Design a protein around this nucleic acid. Structure first.
Length: 410
RNA sequence: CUGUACUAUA
């Protein structure tokens, strides 16, 4: 028949008429309320589409809960499609609803029901200002649900927008860190290798690693790059881990004594396996020659404690020899390192661990190692006995004496 | 006389 070109009707009054609300706090339009901030029972999704009020419901708590509850999950439903198109016609409106205290929860809902086609236009909108969406307290939850839910090439294309950005700022941010960890915990290393190249710099690693939030970023990266373990005929992850663990090893002395970085150092020491070489470097270059000072610190004494727990015998021997005979006695008190750590409110925990390691190590298969652990336990016992009159009045001394109890130091 | 962090939105 004859062609019919149906243009859409111009309506530049919708926003001006949906800007009228009852409460100045709510944004729900007055045609849809019941007077009490709730959504009237005659209101249907066809009414929302007809009055062009998707934004105004999404910016209100009860209107957005209405949208989330009645949003059709099926991708071929007509109302689903019309609502999705209203969401994504304007990029700036979409990025406003992502950054909205309430609207984000709707955006996450359309992610949960999405198909590759929808994910493509969602990804293209998010990529234009991904970094600022990651800093936002509301939009970062959208970004993380995207990283989980998108097809892997789409999420890769998204996370690559973070390259050449101020990643120190984003990593130590209250909101941004959980994005970066999500990337590292979900996407293939090929999608975030620029993070490992960024943390290869010493300055960036220290600033990010010595932070409330960035130390969890560094630890999540180390966990993901090391958990590969075997299943690898080649490497790649080993070279990336090596590139990162290099800076940790070069700056471990500072990191081990920091209020936050101590936990990353403990993870490296405690992990073993693929991190077991790096563990050894940390003890030989940072802990050794500094056991007495680090065992007196609030943060580093946990590092010394896990180092006694997890080290191989050949390093336990050097640590024991440093405590027992590696320090000059105090000029006025003639006090050695062991005497200091017995009565010290942090170092007592180190002494309790030395005893535990020597007790567990008596059951080792090698005879000489068993005799050496027995020798070290006997040295600690003698000093505890010469100071038991004072140690029995402390909780720590009661723990120490009960640990040395009824032993066979063969 | 007992000693450290993050685990964030209605």
């Amino acid at each position: 028949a004859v062609r019919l070109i149906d243009l859409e009707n111009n309506a530049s009054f919708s926003k001006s008429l949906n800007s009228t609300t009852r409460s100045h706090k709510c944004t729900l339009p007055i045609w849809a309320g019941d007077g009490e901030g709730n959504v009237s029972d005659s209101v249907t999704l066809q009414d929302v589409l007809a009055n062009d009020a998707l934004v105004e419901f999404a910016t209100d708590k009860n209107g957005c809960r209405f949208l989330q509850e009645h949003y059709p999950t099926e991708n071929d439903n007509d109302v689903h499609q019309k609502l999705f198109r209203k969401l994504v016609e304007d990029r700036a409106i979409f990025l406003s609803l992502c950054s909205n205290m309430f609207g984000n929860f709707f955006v996450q809902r359309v992610l949960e029901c999405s198909n590759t086609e929808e994910q493509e236009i969602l990804t293209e909108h998010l990529a234009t200002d991904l970094y600022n969406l990651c800093l936002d307290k509301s939009a970062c939850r959208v970004i993380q649900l995207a990283i989980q839910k998108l097809d892997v090439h789409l999420a890769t294309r998204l996370s690559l927008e973070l390259r050449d950005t101020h990643l120190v700022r984003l990593s130590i941010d209250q909101n941004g860190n959980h994005v970066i960890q999500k990337i590292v915990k979900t996407l293939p290393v090929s999608s975030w290798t620029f993070l490992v190249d960024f943390f290869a710099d010493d300055d960036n690693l220290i600033h990010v690693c010595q932070d409330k939030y960035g130390c969890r970023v560094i630890q999540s990266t180390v966990e993901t790059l090391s958990t590969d373990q075997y299943a690898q005929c080649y490497q790649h992850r080993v070279i990336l881990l090596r590139s990162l663990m290099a800076g940790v090893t070069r700056n471990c002395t500072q990191l081990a004594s920091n209020e936050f970085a101590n936990y990353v150092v403990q993870h490296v020491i405690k992990c073993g396996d693929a991190l077991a070489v790096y563990r050894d470097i940390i003890i030989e270059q940072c802990l050794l020659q500094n056991l007495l000072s680090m065992s007196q610190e609030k943060y580093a004494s946990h590092v010394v404690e896990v180092a006694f727990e997890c080290a191989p015998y050949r390093l336990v021997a050097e640590m024991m020899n440093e405590i027992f005979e590696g320090y000059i006695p105090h000029p006025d008190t003639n006090r050695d390192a062991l005497d200091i750590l017995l009565f010290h409110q942090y170092g007592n925990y180190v002494v309790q661990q030395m005893i535990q390691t020597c007790v567990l190590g008596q059951n080792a298969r090698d005879q000489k190692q068993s005799e050496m652990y027995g020798m070290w336990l006997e040295k600690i016992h003698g000093r505890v006995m010469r100071n038991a009159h004072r140690l029995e009045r402390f909780s720590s001394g009661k723990k120490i004496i009960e640990a040395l109890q009824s032993m066979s130091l063969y």
